[PDB]
Design a binder for this molecule. Structure first.
Ligand SMILES: Nc1ncnc2c1ncn2[C@@H]1O[C@H](COP(=O)(O)OP(=O)(O)O)[C@@H](O)[C@H]1O
Ligand SMILES: NC(=[NH2+])NCCC[C@H](N)C(=O)O
Ligand SMILES: [Mg+2]
Length: 356
């Protein structure tokens, strides 16, 4: 590694040490030993530790703070990734390997809120990376364009419920983009954590969204991951939402080669998204449990759930609507991940009904 990058690394390490109230997993796990062990390393694509940690150095409010510029980085900088992955995912040892893909028995999934008084909408997403393309910080503009063509052409073959249209972000009207984001379908533009990871270069080239006309099946192209594959609808019918996601992911996988790792399962740009890559969520109102929000977050954590705002992570709740989802994605099957959301949300609703 070049001196300028080493210099920047020493200054970032210092900045993290000095930030007394920073609570990122980067600060917690980047010890002097770990840092010295990997700061002179570089991947075959030229990714350095600075590329890995810069977002967490610049955004001290990060919860995690690191990303992988390429797949190799997960091992080149293993002494930092491994403890962070073990911490975030609630246990994932050096000797552990993510299990084979296993959607489970869908008929064991239920309707999460039959009377309809708490849950607004239910969503399940996965992420996938295309074999032969590195993650965002290592992509060229031309590669973004190649990937967009490949994914949009593949999605032109979706049929029946999943048939839909690709809408590139380049050329999309501001009004349409804002409506799709306000309606919770399209990814936000301008995320500071992704920007400082150099994940948004050449924006909006190569970025876009595919969706069926009802907007119950969507695919994001070239946001944080090469693909995010999404099923969602109003209400609490997790069984329906999940079955549509399964159908779509199995069909897309038969067509496009995605990166999968013996230890980490499906590869993604952030270590929180490895393994199953799955985030199953509800938009839910729980006014009594959320009155003291520390009670909401504490309750959620005991069910291995995460609370996000209405417009996603790093946002506030609006009108009492919280996004609550499984936090863990690696070291448990797809079935186990969606069941952590189902089981936890059914109990939070029971607790809300029982609360004073
Ligand atoms: N259950 C849900 N219902 C409706 N919209 C949802 C739901 N869960 C998440 N969203 C939306 O998903 C978008 C992405 O939020 P984000 O927190 O970045 O999640 P991810 O990237 O994991 O999909 C936002 O527009 C957010 O409002
Ligand atoms: N979209 C994500 N990968 N979210 C989890 C990480 C987000 C951000 N890098 C942080 O450390 O808080
Ligand atoms: Mg996101």
């Amino acid at each position: 590694v070049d001196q300028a990058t080493l210099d920047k690394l020493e200054a970032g390490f210092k900045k993290l040490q000095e930030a007394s109230d920073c609570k990122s997993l980067l600060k917690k796990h980047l010890t002097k030993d770990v840092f010295d062990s990997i700061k002179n390393k570089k991947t075959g694509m030229g990714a350095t530790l600075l590329d890995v940690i810069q977002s967490g150095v610049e955004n001290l409010d990060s919860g995690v703070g690191i990303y992988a510029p390429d797949a190799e980085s997960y091992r080149t900088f293993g002494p930092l990734f491994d403890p962070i992955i073990d911490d975030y995912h609630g246990g994932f040892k050096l000797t552990d390997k993510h299990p084979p893909k296993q959607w489970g028995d869908i008929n064991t999934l239920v309707g999460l809120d039959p009377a309809g008084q708490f849950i607004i909408s239910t969503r399940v997403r996965c992420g996938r990376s295309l074999q032969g393309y590195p993650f965002n910080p290592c992509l060229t503009a031309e590669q973004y364009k190649e990937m967009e063509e490949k994914v949009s052409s593949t999605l032109s073959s979706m049929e029946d419920e999943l048939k839909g249209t690709y809408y590139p972000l380049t050329g999309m009207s501001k009004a349409t983009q804002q409506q799709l984001i306000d309606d919770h379908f399209l990814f936000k533009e301008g995320d500071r954590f992704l920007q400082t990871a150099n994940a948004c270069r050449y924006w909006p080239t190569g970025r876009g969204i595919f969706h069926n006309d009802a907007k119950t099946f969507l695919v994001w192209v070239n946001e944080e991951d090469h693909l995010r594959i999404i099923s969602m609808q109003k209400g609490g019918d997790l069984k329906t939402v999940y079955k549509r996601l399964v159908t779509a992911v199995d069909n897309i996988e038969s067509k496009l080669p995605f990166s999968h790792d013996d230890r980490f399962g499906f590869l993604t740009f952030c270590p929180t998204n490895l393994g199953t890559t799955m985030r199953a969520s509800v938009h839910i109102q729980l006014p009594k449990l959320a009155k003291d929000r520390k009670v909401l977050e504490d309750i959620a954590s005991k069910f291995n759930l995460q609370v996000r705002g209405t417009r996603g992570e790093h946002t506030e709740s609006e009108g009492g609507v919280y996004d609550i989802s499984n936090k863990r994605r690696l070291g448990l099957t797809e079935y186990q991940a969606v069941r952590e959301m189902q089981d936890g949300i059914l109990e939070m609703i029971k607790m809300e009904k029982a609360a004073a």
